Coordinates of C-alpha atoms in Angstrom, one line a residue:
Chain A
X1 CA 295.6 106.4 169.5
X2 CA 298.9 106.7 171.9
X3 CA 300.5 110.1 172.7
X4 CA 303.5 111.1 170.9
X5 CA 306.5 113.7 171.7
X6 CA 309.8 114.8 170.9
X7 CA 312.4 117.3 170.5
X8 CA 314.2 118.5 167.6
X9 CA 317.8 120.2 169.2
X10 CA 321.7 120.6 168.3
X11 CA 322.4 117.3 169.9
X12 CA 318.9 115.8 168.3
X13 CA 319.4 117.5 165.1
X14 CA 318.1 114.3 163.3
X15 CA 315.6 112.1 165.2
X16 CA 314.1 108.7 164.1
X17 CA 310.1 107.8 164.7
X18 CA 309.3 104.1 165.0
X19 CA 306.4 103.0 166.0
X20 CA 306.1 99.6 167.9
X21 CA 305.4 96.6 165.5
X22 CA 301.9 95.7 167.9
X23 CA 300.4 99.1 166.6
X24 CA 301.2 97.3 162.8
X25 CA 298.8 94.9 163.5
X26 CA 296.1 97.9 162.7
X27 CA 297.4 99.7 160.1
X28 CA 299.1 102.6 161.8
X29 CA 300.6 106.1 160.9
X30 CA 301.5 109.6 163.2
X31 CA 299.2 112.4 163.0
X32 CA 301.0 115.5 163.7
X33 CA 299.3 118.7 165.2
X34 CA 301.3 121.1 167.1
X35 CA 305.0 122.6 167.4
X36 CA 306.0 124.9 169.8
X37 CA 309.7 126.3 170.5
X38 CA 311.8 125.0 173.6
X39 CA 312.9 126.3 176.3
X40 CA 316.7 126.7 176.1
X41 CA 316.1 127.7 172.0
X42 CA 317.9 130.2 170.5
X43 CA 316.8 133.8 168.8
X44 CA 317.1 132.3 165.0
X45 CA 315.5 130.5 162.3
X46 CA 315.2 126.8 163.2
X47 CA 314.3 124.7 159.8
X48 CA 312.3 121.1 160.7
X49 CA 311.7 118.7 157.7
X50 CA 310.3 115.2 157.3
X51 CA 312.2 113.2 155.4
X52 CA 311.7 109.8 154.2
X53 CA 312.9 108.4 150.4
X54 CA 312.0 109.4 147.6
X55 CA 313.9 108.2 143.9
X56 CA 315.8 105.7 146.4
X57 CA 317.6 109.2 147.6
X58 CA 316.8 111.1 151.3
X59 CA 314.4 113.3 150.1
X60 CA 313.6 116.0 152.9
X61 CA 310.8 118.3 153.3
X62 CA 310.7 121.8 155.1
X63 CA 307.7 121.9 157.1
X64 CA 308.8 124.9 159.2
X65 CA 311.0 127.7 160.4
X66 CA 310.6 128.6 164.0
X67 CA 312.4 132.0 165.7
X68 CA 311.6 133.7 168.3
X69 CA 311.4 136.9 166.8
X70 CA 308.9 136.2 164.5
X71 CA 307.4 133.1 164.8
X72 CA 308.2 130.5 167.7
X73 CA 305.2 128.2 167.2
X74 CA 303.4 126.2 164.4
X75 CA 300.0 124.1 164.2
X76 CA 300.5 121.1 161.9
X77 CA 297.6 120.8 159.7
X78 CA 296.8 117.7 157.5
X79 CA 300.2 115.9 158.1
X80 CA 300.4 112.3 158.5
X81 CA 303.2 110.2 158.4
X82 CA 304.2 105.9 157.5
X83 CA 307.0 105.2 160.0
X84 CA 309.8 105.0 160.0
X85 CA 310.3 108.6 159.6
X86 CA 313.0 110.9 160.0
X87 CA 312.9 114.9 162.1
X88 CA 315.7 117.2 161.0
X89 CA 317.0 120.6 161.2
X90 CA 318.9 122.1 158.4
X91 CA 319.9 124.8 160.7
X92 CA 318.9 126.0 164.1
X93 CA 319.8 125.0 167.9
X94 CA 316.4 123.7 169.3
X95 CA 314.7 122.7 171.1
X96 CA 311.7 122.4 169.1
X97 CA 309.3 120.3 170.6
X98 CA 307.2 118.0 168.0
X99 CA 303.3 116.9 169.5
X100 CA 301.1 114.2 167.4
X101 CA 299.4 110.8 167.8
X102 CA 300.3 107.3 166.9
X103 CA 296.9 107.0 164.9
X104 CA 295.9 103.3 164.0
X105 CA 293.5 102.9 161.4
X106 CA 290.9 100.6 161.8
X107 CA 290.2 98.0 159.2
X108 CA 287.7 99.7 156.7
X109 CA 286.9 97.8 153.7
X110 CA 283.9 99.8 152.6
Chain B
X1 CA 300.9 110.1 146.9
X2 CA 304.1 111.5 146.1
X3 CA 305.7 114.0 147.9
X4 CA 306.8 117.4 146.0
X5 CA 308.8 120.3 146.8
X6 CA 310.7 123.3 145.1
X7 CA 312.2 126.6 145.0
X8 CA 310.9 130.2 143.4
X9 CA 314.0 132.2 143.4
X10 CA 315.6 135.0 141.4
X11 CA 317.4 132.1 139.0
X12 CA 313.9 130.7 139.1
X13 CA 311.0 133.7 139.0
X14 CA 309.2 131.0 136.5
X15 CA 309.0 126.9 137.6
X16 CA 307.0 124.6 135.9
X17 CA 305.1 121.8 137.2
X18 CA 304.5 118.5 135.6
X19 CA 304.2 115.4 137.0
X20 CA 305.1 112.1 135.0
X21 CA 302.6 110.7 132.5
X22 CA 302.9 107.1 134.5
X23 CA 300.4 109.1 137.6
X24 CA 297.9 110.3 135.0
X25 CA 297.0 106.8 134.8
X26 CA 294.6 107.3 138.0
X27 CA 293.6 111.0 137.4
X28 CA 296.1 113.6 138.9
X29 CA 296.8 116.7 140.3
X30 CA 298.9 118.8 142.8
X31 CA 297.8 119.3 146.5
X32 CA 299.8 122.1 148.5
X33 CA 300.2 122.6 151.9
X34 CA 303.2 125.0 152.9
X35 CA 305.2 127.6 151.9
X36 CA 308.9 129.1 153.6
X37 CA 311.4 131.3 153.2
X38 CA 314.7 130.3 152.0
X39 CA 318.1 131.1 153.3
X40 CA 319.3 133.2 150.6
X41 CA 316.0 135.2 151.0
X42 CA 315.9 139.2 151.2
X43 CA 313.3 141.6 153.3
X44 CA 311.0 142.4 150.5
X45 CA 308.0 141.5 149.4
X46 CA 308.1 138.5 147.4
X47 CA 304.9 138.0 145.2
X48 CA 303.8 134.1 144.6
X49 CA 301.3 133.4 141.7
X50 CA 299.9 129.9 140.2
X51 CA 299.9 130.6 136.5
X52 CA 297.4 128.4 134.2
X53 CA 295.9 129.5 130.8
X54 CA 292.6 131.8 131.0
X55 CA 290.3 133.2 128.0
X56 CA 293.7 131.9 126.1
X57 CA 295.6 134.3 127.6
X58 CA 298.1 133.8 130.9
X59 CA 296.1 134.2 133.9
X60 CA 298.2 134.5 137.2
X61 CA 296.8 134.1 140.6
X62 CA 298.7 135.9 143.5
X63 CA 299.1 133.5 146.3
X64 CA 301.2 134.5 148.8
X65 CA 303.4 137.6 149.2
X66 CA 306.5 136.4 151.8
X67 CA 308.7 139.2 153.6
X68 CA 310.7 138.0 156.6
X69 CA 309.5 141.4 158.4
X70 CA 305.8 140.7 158.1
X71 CA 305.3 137.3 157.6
X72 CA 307.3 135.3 155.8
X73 CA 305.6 132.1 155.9
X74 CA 301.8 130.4 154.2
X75 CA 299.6 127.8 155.2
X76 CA 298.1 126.4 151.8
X77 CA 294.7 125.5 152.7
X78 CA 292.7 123.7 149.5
X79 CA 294.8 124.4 146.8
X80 CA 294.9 121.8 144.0
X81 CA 296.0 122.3 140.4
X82 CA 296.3 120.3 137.1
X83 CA 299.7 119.8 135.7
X84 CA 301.5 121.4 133.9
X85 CA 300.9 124.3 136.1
X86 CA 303.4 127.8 136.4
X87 CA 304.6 129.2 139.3
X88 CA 305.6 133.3 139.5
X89 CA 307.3 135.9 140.8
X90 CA 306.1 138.9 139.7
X91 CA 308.9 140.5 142.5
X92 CA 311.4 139.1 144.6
X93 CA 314.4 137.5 144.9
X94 CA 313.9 134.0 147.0
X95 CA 314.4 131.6 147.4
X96 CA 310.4 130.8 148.7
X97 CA 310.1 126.7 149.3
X98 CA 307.1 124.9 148.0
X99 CA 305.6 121.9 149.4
X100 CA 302.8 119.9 148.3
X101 CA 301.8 116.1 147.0
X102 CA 301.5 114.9 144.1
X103 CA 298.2 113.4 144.7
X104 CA 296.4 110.8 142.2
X105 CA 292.5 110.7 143.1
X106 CA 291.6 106.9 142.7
X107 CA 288.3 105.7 140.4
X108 CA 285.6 106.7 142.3
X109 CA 282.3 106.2 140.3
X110 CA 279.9 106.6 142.9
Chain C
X1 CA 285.4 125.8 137.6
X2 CA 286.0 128.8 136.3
X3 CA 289.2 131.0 137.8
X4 CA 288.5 134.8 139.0
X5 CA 290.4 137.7 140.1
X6 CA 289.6 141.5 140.9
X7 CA 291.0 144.0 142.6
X8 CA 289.8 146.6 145.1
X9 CA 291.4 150.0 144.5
X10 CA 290.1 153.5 144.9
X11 CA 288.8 153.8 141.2
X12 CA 287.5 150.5 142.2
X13 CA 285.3 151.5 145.7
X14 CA 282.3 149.2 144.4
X15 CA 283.3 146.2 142.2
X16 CA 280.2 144.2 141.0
X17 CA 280.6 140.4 140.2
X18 CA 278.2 139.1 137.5
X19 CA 279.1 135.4 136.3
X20 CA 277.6 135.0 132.7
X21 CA 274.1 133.9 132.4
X22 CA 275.3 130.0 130.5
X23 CA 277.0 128.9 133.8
X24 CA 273.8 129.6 135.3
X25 CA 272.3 126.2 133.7
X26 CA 274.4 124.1 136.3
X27 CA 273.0 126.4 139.5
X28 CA 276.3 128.6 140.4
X29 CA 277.6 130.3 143.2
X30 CA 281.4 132.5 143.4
X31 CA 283.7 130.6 146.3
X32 CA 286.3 132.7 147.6
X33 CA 289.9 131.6 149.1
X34 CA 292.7 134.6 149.1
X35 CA 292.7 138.6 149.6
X36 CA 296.4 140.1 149.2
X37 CA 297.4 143.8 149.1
X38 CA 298.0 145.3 145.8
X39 CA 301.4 146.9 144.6
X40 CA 300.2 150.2 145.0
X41 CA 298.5 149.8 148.2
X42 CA 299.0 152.2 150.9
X43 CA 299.5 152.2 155.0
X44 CA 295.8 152.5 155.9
X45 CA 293.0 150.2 156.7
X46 CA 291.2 148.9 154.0
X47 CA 288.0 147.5 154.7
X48 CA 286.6 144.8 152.7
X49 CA 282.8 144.3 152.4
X50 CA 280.5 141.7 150.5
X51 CA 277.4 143.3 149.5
X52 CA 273.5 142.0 148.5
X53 CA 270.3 142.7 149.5
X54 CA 268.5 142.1 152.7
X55 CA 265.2 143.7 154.2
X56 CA 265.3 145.6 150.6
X57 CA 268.2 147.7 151.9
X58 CA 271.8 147.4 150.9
X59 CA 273.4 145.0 153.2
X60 CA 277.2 144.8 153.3
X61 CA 279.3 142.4 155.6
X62 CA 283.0 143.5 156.2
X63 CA 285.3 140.9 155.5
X64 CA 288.3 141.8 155.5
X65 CA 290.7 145.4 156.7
X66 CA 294.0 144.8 155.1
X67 CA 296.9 147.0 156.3
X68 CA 300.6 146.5 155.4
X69 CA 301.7 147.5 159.1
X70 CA 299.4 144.6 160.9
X71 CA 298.1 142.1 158.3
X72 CA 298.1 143.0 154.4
X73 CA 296.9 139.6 153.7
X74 CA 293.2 137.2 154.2
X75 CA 292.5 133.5 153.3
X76 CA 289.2 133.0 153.0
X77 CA 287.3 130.2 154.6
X78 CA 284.0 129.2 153.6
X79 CA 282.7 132.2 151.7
X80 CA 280.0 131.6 148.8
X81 CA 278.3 134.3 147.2
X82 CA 275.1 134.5 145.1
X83 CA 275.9 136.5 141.9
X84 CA 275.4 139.3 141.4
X85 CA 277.4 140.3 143.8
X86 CA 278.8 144.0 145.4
X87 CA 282.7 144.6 146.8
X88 CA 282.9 147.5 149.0
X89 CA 285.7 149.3 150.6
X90 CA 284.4 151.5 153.0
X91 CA 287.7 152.8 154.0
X92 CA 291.2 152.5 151.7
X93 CA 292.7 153.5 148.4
X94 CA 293.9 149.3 147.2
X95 CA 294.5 147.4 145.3
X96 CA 292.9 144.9 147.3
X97 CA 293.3 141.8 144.8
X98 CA 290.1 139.3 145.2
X99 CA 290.9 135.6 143.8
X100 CA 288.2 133.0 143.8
X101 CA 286.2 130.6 141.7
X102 CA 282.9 130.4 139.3
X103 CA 282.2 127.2 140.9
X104 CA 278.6 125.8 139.1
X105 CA 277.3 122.8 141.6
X106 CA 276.2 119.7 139.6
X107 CA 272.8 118.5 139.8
X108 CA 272.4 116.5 142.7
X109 CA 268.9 115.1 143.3
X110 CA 270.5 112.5 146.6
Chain D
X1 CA 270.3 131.7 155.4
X2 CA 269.5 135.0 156.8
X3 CA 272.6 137.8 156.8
X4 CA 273.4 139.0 160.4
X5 CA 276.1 141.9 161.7
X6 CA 276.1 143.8 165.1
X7 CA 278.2 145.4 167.0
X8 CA 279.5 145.6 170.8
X9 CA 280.7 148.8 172.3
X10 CA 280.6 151.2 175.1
X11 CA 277.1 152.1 174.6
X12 CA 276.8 148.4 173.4
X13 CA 278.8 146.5 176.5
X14 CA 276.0 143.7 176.3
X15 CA 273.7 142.4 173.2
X16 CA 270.8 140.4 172.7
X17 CA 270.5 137.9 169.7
X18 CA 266.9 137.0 168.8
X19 CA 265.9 135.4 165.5
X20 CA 262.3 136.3 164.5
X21 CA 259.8 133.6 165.4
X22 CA 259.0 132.9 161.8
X23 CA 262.3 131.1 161.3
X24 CA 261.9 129.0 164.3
X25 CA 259.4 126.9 162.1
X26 CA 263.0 125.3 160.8
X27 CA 265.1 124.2 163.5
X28 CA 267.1 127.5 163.9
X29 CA 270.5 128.7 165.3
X30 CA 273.0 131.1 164.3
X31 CA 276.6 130.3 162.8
X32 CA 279.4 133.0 163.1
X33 CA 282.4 133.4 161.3
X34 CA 284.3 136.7 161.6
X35 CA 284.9 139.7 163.8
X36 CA 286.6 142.7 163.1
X37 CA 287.3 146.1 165.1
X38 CA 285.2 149.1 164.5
X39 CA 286.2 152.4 163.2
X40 CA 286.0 154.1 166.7
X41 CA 287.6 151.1 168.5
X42 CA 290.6 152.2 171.1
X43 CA 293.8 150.5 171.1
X44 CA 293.1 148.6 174.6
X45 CA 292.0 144.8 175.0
X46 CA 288.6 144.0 174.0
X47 CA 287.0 140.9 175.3
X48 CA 284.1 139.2 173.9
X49 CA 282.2 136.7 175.2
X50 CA 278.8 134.7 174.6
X51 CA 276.6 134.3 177.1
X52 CA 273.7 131.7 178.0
X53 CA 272.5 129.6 181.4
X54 CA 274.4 127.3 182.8
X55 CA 273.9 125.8 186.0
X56 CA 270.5 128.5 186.1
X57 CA 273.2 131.5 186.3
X58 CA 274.4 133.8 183.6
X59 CA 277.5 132.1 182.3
X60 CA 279.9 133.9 179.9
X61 CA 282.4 132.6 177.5
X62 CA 285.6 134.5 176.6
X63 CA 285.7 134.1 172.9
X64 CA 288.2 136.8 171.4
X65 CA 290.0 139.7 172.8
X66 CA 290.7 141.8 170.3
X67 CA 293.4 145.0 170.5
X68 CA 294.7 146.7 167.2
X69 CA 298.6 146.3 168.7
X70 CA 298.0 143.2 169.4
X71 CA 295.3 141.8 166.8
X72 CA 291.8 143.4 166.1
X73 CA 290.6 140.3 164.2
X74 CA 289.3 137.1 165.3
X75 CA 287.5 134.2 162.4
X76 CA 285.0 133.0 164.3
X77 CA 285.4 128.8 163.8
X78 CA 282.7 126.0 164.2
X79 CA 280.5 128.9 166.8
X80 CA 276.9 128.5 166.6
X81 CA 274.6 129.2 169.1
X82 CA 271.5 129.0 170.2
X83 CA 269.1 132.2 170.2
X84 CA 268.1 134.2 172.5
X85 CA 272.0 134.9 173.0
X86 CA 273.7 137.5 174.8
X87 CA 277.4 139.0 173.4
X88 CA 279.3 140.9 176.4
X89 CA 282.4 142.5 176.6
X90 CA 283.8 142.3 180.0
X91 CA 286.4 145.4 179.2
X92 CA 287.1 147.3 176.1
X93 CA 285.1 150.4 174.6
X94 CA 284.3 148.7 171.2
X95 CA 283.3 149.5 168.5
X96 CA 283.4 145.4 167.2
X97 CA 281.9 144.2 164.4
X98 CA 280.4 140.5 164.7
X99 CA 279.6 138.9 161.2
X100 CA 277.3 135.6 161.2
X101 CA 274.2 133.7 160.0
X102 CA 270.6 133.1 160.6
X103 CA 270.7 129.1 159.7
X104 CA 267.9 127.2 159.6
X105 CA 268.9 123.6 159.7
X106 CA 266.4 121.6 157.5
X107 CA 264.1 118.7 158.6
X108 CA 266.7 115.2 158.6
X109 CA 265.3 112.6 159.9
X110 CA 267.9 110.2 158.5
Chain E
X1 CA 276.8 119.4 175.0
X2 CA 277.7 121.1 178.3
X3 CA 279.7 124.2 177.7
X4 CA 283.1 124.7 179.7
X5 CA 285.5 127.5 181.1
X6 CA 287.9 127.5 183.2
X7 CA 291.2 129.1 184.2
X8 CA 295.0 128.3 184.2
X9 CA 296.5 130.6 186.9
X10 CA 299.5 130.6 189.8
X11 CA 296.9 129.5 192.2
X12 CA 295.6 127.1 189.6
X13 CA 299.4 125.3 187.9
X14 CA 297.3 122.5 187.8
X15 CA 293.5 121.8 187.1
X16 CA 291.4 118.5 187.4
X17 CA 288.7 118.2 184.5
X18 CA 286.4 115.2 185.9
X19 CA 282.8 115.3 184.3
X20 CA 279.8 114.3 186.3
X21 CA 279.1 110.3 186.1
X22 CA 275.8 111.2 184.7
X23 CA 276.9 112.3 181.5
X24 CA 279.1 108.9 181.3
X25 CA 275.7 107.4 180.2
X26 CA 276.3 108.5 176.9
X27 CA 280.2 108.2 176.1
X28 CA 281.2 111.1 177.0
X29 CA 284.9 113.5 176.2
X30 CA 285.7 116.9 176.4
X31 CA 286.3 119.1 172.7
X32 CA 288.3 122.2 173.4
X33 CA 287.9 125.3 171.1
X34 CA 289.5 128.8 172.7
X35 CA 292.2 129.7 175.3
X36 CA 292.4 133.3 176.0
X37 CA 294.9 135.4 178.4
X38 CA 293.8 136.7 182.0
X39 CA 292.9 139.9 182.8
X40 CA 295.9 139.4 185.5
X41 CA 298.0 137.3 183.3
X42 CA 301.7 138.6 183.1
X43 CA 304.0 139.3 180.3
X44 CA 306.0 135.8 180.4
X45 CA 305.7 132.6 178.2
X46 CA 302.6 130.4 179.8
X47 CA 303.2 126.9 178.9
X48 CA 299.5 125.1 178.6
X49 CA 300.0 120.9 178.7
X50 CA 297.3 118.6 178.4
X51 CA 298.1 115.6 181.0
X52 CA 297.6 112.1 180.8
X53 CA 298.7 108.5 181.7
X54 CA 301.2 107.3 179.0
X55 CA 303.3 104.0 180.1
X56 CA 302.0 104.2 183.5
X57 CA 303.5 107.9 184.0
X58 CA 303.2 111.3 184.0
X59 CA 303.1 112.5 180.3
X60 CA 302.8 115.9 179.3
X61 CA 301.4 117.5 176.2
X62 CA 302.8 121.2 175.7
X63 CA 299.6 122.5 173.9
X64 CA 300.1 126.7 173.5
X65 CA 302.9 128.9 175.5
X66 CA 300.4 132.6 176.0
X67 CA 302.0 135.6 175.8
X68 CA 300.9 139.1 175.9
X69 CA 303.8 140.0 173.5
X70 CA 303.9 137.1 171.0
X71 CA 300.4 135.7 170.6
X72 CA 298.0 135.3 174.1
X73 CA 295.6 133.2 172.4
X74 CA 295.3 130.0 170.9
X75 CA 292.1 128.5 168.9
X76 CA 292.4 124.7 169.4
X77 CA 291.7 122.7 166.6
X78 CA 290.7 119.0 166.9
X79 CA 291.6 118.2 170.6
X80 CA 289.2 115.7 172.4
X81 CA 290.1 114.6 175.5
X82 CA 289.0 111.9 178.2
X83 CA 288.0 112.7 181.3
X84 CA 290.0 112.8 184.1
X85 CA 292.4 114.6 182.4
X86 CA 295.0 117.5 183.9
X87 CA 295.7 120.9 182.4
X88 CA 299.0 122.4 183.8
X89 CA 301.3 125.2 183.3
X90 CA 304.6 124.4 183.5
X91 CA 306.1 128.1 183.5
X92 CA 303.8 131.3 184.0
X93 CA 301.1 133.0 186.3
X94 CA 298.3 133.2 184.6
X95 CA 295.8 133.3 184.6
X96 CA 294.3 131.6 181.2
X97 CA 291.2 130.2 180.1
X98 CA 290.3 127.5 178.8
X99 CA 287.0 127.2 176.7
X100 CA 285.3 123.9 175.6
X101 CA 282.2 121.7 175.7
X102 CA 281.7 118.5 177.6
X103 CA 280.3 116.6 174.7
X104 CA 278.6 113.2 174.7
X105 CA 278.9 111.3 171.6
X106 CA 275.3 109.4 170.9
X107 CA 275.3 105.5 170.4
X108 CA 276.4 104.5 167.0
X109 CA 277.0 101.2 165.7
X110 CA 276.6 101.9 162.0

């Protein structure tokens, strides 16, 4: 279970998670928990999405909005994700900082 | 698990929900997690029902009620339906994003 | 699984839940998820209250005070009544609208 | 399953949580799940702790803090406790209203 | 299942959680629950980090940011850490509490 972080931002508008190929070897996802607005963000609505395919197309999915004037943070309940994935912000400055676990799961074939 | 999301908005007060016939093949329904604000959204209250067939009649069920100055976001926490399924407006203007899964619960006999 | 909805107003004070006595062969209970404010609501706390019996005397449990000025709204987590049942407002004129589930638990001798 | 409600205040800065004996024949504890303010609460923090020993002195636990500009709520999550208990509020004049159970947990030897 | 508190101040930037070798009899982590504000804290962002080794450096987990103004409380869902770890604060002046239990899971090889 290794410690994951990153930052969503106007030069990291899109970012990419890929986990290393040795986590494969047990078959591995990213458990996401916490969100929390950056330091140098902005007063307006900052749109993060996972996105992976879907119909062959980039399908994207708005997860949240963060601003400070209403709400800056979000806890990240029940998400987990197959890398590669892809963080993007329809609109918004950042930084929004992204908190989870590379989560292996053990072989279970009960 | 496939991965689902639309749009309530004043074009769309009414969306329906029905899943391909190919997924009822390993029994079906529709697991939601989040709903946001759209861009084109206005500050009132906008009033979120899922809609299913009751005593015959339409039965709604008031979900969520966004308004970017009280809170314009929901957390769905263990809300599944059975396709077809209607989502309502009974006011506002959107657009309000839906997210959820499309989630197929495997044979489980035990 | 039957779906069920009330509202809390103030013609509506004391609203008394009775499932009917055939989804009492498969031993039943009322589970409860979402609160909202009504249409007509007004700018005043309105205190929510499940009601029953205990020591002989009429024991109620506030829930819930909705206001449209600090939180209209209540998801409720793990709340399973015994019908019949008592709503109470204590303070507030509503609608209060009450959405849950006739849930009847299967036989489960394990 | 017992039905249990207090409430701390000024005249109620500290109190005691005793189940009856009689339900100490099945291993016994109590499970909370909501607080809300009271009727004559002031708009000031409020903060609520449970006590026990540790260490053989009185230790106290800041659970909630509740103020209604702020937020007079709390939902009291995975708390349970193991009588006698003491509730303390190191400032605030109350009054706040504590909603739990008397739980029993049944003989498992599995 | 010892139960935890402590605090996140100016003095305090960064805190040492090491439980006693005693307890690492039975393997042994730390569940957090609450985090509340000071009764000196300030009215600033307070940026709460859970600290560990990740690659052989320094890593930092922004966990909740405390203010008086925006939310100064956080209930923390699912976090289980091992011991040593570090709490820091990488803007504020606190203080803030932290509230847990030192929990030892039992042997089980099922």
């Amino acid at each position: 279970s290794l410690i994951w972080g990153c930052e969503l931002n106007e030069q990291n508008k899109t970012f990419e998670f890929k986990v290393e190929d040795d986590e494969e070897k047990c078959e591995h996802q990213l458990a996401l928990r916490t969100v929390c607005l950056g330091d140098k963000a902005k007063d307006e609505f900052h749109i993060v999405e996972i996105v992976t395919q879907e119909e062959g197309a980039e399908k994207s999915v708005p997860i949240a909005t963060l601003k400070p004037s209403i709400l800056p943070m979000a806890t990240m309940v029940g998400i987990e994700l197959t890398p590669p994935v892809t963080f993007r912000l329809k609109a918004g400055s950042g930084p929004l900082y992204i908190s989870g676990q590379h989560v292996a799961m053990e072989e279970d074939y009960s």
